[PDB]
Amino acid sequence: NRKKLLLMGRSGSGKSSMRSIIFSNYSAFDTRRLGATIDVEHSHLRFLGNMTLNLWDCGGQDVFMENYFTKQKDHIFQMVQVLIHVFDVESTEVLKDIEIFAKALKQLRKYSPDAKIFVLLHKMDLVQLDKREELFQIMMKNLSETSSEFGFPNLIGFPTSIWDESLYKAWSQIVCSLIPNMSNHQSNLKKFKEIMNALEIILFERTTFLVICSSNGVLLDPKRFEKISNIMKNFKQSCTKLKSGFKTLILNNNIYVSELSSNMVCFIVLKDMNIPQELVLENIKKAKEFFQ
Amino acid sequence: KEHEHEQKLLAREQELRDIVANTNDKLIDISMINNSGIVIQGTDLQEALDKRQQEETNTFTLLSKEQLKKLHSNILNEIFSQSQVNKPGPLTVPF
Amino acid sequence: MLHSKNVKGFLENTLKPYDLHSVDFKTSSLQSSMIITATNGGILSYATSNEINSVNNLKMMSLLIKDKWSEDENDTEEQHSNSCYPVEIDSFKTKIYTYEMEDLHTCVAQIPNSDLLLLFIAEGSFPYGLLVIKIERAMRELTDLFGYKLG
Amino acid sequence: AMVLLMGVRRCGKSSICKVVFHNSTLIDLAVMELPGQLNYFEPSYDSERLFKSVGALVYVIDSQDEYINAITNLAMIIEYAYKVNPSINIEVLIHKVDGLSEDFKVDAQRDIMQRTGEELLELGLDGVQVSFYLTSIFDHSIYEAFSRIVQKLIPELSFLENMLDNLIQHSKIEKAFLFDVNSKIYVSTDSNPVDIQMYEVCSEFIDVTIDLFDLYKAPELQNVSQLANGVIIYLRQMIRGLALVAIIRPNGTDMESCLTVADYNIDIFKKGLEDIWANA
Amino acid sequence: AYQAELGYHESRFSENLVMLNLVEFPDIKPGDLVELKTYHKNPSASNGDKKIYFIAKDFDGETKRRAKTSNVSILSGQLQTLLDLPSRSRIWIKLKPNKFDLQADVVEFNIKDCLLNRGDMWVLSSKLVDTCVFMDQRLAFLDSIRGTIKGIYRNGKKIVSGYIGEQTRIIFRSESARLIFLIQITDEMWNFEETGEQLFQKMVNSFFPKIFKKWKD
Ligand SMILES: Nc1nc2c(ncn2[C@@H]2O[C@H](COP(=O)(O)OP(=O)(O)O)[C@@H](O)[C@H]2O)c(=O)[nH]1
Ligand SMILES: Nc1nc2c(ncn2[C@@H]2O[C@H](COP(=O)(O)OP(=O)(O)O)[C@@H](O)[C@H]2O)c(=O)[nH]1
Ligand SMILES: [Mg+2]
């Protein structure tokens, strides 16, 4: 179960910043000290307990980018499952970025045409708040007209930044496109939701704290998953100060955050506030071996 | 008027010390939980004996059957009938 | 797994009082009816006849009752005690212990071959024999929870 | 107890207010900023009531820029502030000290203290004690400085200290803080030293609590967060904006028994806190 | 050996670093040298165990009156960070009675950015007698001069904490001092070494930059 993810972009696009924050556990202020990635940096990251991710943090500078599509084209773009192209909105060479993306799409269509393309419009915190979404539209349409040209009828894009929680949503949806047996996880989560009579049950990953699945797939915030992921990353970094690891968290006897297994974390919001804690904890412990 | 404020401050000091003493008196440690001694084995006869001890010889001398035999059985049946509790469904659900 | 709603309904039903008709002898309802663990003594499920303060007090009382029961379960001397009513239903042996907590009558019974306890607390005027019969007939209908251990 | 923030322009008063109070006596009230530029002070320009209505005056000195004129202006302010009301506590924050060494920080604080003392000796003010705190936005220093300033304006400090010490001694609590829901300004603690790491743990626990609660709304805040080593962190909302966060150690005991006795003890403590009008 | 519960206290109560309950374990007189080892047999390095010598002193009146266990209290700041133990832990206590035989041989010192006379060093060493020190302890002289105990030696071992006695050779190294360089310009400066480097090239390309980098570090 080896998944080959490519992480490409232009110079200074922030690819290694995403790789460090999501997986290597770096803060937002600690990405300024990062150097320039030379050629391709490989990272073998173990997701859940069975998945292994071969993330290829590519260079992004002009010599490396010209080298990718001429000499190493038979190596970087073969047996590829997911491409993640990072577009910087601070770039003044947007047409060159679109041409680089077109060459990457052409190579992927030539070699491994079953892959999944994702685009992240990074550094979307320097732009003013009023012109963000429209800008995300204005590029994306063009990218769609590019993406449908070289095969690939579908292309999913995300307005991302390292100073908010959108990175977690983008990376969660990128990673979840590779997780096997998602239907079984959804069915078991629905069964547990019916059994415990819970308002919403969300299943994460323990290390990266990315969302894996949700019970639902009073109006609630549509961006609650990424906010909970950011809050849990902050709480893990806070609990590292006490020389220990986070295990459980009970809020108002209504919100239970529990270590479901050695690779997942469950976030259960129930309906009745009068349930004793031990019954919910026991039912959590019974389902610990079920999701394994 | 400031002497009245001094007396008010003295009363406030006494009241705050009384509040501290009152909230200090209800603190229960785990040693108090483990060795409480409140939970003691009690029977009806021992409770009646303790009640008579706090309130304060062979009295009985050795000398119908149908009515007593009917009433005892009816009382036992009425006791056993109301103790029958029917569950509203299964207690443990499978996967 | 477990179902909190059915256990809640069962514990609410065990709060029903007795109203004898052949002999006019009305009894009050039990103060509380709960199912607790046999390891830490905390409340797994609970029900009251009639809010946070009472829940905390009931948890403290459950802890005290389990603390008193732990030494009684591990003691074999003076086994022929008058307050012990060991019943065996469906070839499953258990021991039932009654206690007096000031003005409260507390009857506890371990669910046989399992790590759970059932506890009924009533007022001081409640007879102990009716409590014993109540807890025996309650344990009679709990055959589905037999053999259940904490994970 | 309204505190007045004073300083030169571009010293950081608005940034401090935004960071702390935006993320009565004890609650984080809407404080008053006062941009004071160098000039000649008008004698009694209807400012007696204003400075009589300030519980404690806070002065902000930028350590990056030159500050001898700032100290002169501060002494000029104190010269009438102490004359109008002899009960005002006077506070000075040496702000923007993030990029300085420890020896440089200590020497700068000593120089500022000596200059302020010499200027107050020249102006003839006696019996005045001005406190100094090295503050910065990017770390915990400003929160602790405002904590000390607020603690100087609660007359029931020692009684709260005794109540928290008794609560800690009878619940196996490692460290208990009486935070406020906003601004993360802890109001009372025990006699144990305020560890910076534990304070940051409790503050980010406050943040996690409030954010997670705000994510699920529109249907008394309580929290138990247990770590791998059994150390638990507990939150219970007190009267008004106050909340209690306690790091409690199990010491090889039952988790649920410790939680039950801690809940009962903390409910008793809240019932005791209901009697004293320390809220708001 | 004895057993004790660790404690911490702020500088408001007491200024001493380590305090112990004199009423408990009354074998120790008020003036004594006491080890504060946290290990009882099989010392552990990965787990973290240290021996910290100190001089016995009684609790403060306010702390002894309003007391809450904690047979041994350590002042917060540097000693707490060095020990790195929770607020209530198990520690051990000995009563090493050979003050003369447990003297450290060499105790270092740093006098950066301040002028101490030779007699000032003598007086500061005289005040550091019958007082136990440890590594990186910032002493203070006349409330302005800062010190740093960067090394305590005994029997060829660099001990973490030591006892300074009457026969301890305490030295005062200076981190801000005047230096004179005397470079010989001779016929050999333009000669070549065996590898192929001129000697002045070594002086201006390898010696001076390294010494300036080390001075800045
Ligand atoms: N302000 C801001 N800076 C960013 C963002 N993303 C990345 N950066 C900057 O990008 C720099 C590192 O870029 P890097 O990951 O090495 O680019 P790469 O080598 O092409 O992957 C850091 O100094 C960050 O300050 C963002 O969303 N906002
Ligand atoms: N590095 C740093 N800069 C600060 C700090 N506090 C304030 N500043 C700077 O001060 C500026 C804001 O000052 P401001 O609050 O508007 O001044 P005021 O309006 O007179 O109160 C910002 O641009 C910050 O760069 C600090 O703690 N650290
Ligand atoms: Mg890179």
Nearest to D263 among C40, C41, C56 (CB): C56
Residue type, A216: N
What SS3 class is residue C24? Answer: coil
Taking CA atoms, C97 is separated from A221, C32, C66, D110, in Å, by: 52, 16, 11, 72
Nearest partner of D191 among E64, B31, A243, E18, judged by Cα: E64
C21 is written with which tokens?
């008709």
CA-CA distance, E208 to E185, in Å (whole number)? 16
DSSP reduced 3-state for A1 = coil
Chain D nearest C-alpha distance from B25 (Å): 10
Residue ranges per structural domain of chain A: 1-182, 183-292
Amino acid at position B89, single letter: G
**With respect to CATH, is domain A1-182 assigned 3.40.50.300?**
yes
Technique of determination:
cryo-EM
C-alpha to C-alpha distance for E150 and E137, rounded to whole angstroms: 8
A–D: how many Cβ contacts below 8 A?
Answer: 84
Of D103, D192, D251, Cβ closest to residue E8: D192
Q: D96 CB under 6 A from ligand 2?
A: yes
Beta strand pairing call for E90-93 and E145-146: unpaired
Q: Which residues contact C144 (CB under 8 A, 6 or more apart)?
A: B90, B91, B92
Task: Give the helix/strand (H/E) hosting A250.
Answer: strand A246-251
Selecting from D169, D193, D251 the residue whose C-beta is nearest the C-beta of E8 gives D193
Q: Tokens for E94? A: 């000995």
Distance CA C117, CA C109 (A): 6
State the DSSP code for C91. Answer: T
Size of chain E, expressed as the number of residues it contains: 217
Which residues of chain D lie closer than 8 angstroms to B28, CB-CB? 170, 261, 264-265
CATH label, A183-292, candidates 3.30.450.190, 3.40.920.10, 3.30.70.380, 3.20.20.70: 3.30.450.190
Pocket probe mutation, ligand 2, options D15, D31, D96, max atoms within 8 Å of Cβ: D15
Same fold for the pair A1-182 and A183-292:
no
- Residue whose CA lies nearest to ligand 2 atom number 22: D12
What's the length of chain D? 280
Q: Which helix (H) or strand (E) holds A14?
A: none
Q: If DSSP codes are grouped into helix, strand and coil, which group holds residue C92?
A: strand
**CA neighbours closer than 13 Å in the CB half-sphere of residue E180:** 2
Question: Do C and D make contact, counting contact as 3+ CB pairs within 8 angstroms?
Answer: yes
Q: What is the DSSP letter of D27?
A: S
> In the CATH hierarchy, which fold is given to the domain comprising D158-277?
Beta-Lactamase (3.30.450)
**Exposure letters A96-121 (e unless 16+ CB within 10 A, then b):** ebbebbebbbbbbbebeeebbbbbbb
Binding site membership of A116 for ligand 1 (Cβ less than 6 Å): no
Q: Which two tokens stand for residue A285?
A: 């412990």
Contacts 24+ apart (CB under 8 A), A251-255: A251/D209, A251/D212, A251/D213, A251/D221, A251/D222, A251/D223, A252/D213, A252/D220, A252/D221, A252/D222, A253/A277, A253/D222, A254/D216, A255/D212, A255/D216
Name the minimum distance, in Å, from the CA of D265 to any CA of chain C.
Answer: 10
- When computed from its CA atoms, the radius of gyration of chain D, rounded to whole angstroms, is 21
Intrachain domains D1-157 and D158-277 with the same fold: no
Alpha-helical (H) ranges within C78-117 are none
Inter-residue contact D179 to D243 (CB < 8 Å): yes
Amino acid code (one letter) for C107 = C
Per this entry, what is the length of chain B?
Answer: 95
- DSSP state, residue D154: -
Q: How many residues does chain C have?
A: 151
CATH class (in words) of the domain with range D1-157: alpha beta
Residues 6+ apart with CB under 8 A from E214: none
- Residue B19 tokens read as 């509040």
D interface test, pick of B23, B34, B36 with most D CB neighbours within 10 Å: B23
- Tell if the CB–CB gap between A279 and C37 is shorter than 8 Å: no
Chains B, D: CB pairs < 8 Å: 45
For C57, nearest residue in chain D (alpha carbons):
D264
Angle at D117 between CA D116 and CA D121, to 5 degrees: 115
Q: Provide residues of D within 8 Å CB-CB of chain E.
A: 103, 110, 165, 168-169, 174-175, 191-193, 195, 249, 251
* Ramachandran angles phi, psi of D57, nearest 5°: -90, 135
With touching defined as 3 or more inter-chain CB pairs under 8 Å, the answer for chains B and C is yes
For residues E76 and E85, is the Cβ–Cβ distance under 8 A?
no
Alpha helices (H) along chain D: 13-22, 48-52, 68-84, 102-123, 141-151, 157-169, 196-215, 255-275
CA C122 from chain center: how many Å?
10
**Cβ separation A286–C45 shorter than 8 A:** no
CB interface of C with A, residues 32-91, below 8 Å: 37, 42-46
Other chains touching A, judged by 3 or more CB pairs under 8 Å:
B, C, D
**Spacing, Cα A18 to ligand 3 middle (Å):** 10
Give this entry's resolution in angstroms.
3.1
The residues spanned by each domain of chain D are 1-157, 158-277
Yes or no, beta carbons of C64 and B33 under 8 Å apart: yes
Nearest to D91 by CA among D37, D39, D199, D16: D16
Residue C85 CB partners (closer than 8 Å, separation 6+):
C95, C96, C98, C132, C136
Question: How far from C117 is each of A178, B62, B83, C140, E23, CA to CA, in Å?
Answer: 46, 45, 19, 14, 47
Nearest to B93 among A188, A195, A290 (CB): A195
